[PDB]
């Protein structure tokens with residue numbers, strides 16, 4: 008039917024895998040096993056359309072990408088709200104996306120994850136400002152509670168549809 012190729016990128020430990028696994032498998036991964044490159048598939052109905060999501064869960068750790076990202080149609084750019092450095096490095100991921108796609112207009116959503124945690128160093132307004140400069144939505148999530156998880160991924164699908 009209708010297939011959407013989604014790619015999740017961002018710094019090591021920000022919760023890329025936990026987000027993807029919550030969406031697809033409906034549980035929270037508490038442990039931290041660094042990812043190399045994993046993929047997930049699932050059929051879902053989004054706004055009345057039956058569709059297939061193909062989700063690529065990428066590595067954040069420099070040790071553990073460009074080739075995999077090439078076929079991506081939309082990207083979640085993830086940072087954690089308790090990790091200022093992960094936010095500051097979002098530009099690096101966007102730059103990589105623009106290179107692999109050879110376009111300055113690629114569907115993306117900015118995601119501030121771990122919103123259940125109280126040691127916040129990135130305020131919502133700061134992230135909204137970054138997103139606005141890129142012309143994309145900002146959404147906060149918790150892979151732990153499931154807050155915003157479906158919204159983040161489904162919003163990305165709706166961004167691809169505007170492309």
Ligand SMILES: Nc1nc2c(ncn2[C@@H]2O[C@H](COP(=O)(O)OP(=O)(O)NP(=O)(O)O)[C@@H](O)[C@H]2O)c(=O)[nH]1
Pocket residue numbers: 017018019020021022023024025026036037038039040041042043065066067068120121122123124148149150151152
């Ligand atoms: N409290 C809380 N912990 C979270 C959340 N998301 C992820 N974590 C925790 O953060 C750690 C790293 O999560 P993980 O999903 O493995 O991160 P990653 O971005 O995929 N890492 P990598 O880039 O190395 O593959 C895990 O211990 C996980 O339980 C969240 O929303 N809230």
Ligand SMILES: [Ca+2]
Pocket residue numbers: 034035036037
């Ligand atoms: Ca668990």
Ligand SMILES: [Ca+2]
Pocket residue numbers: 105106107108109
């Ligand atoms: Ca290129």
Ligand SMILES: [Mg+2]
Pocket residue numbers: 023024025040041042064065066
């Ligand atoms: Mg991972």
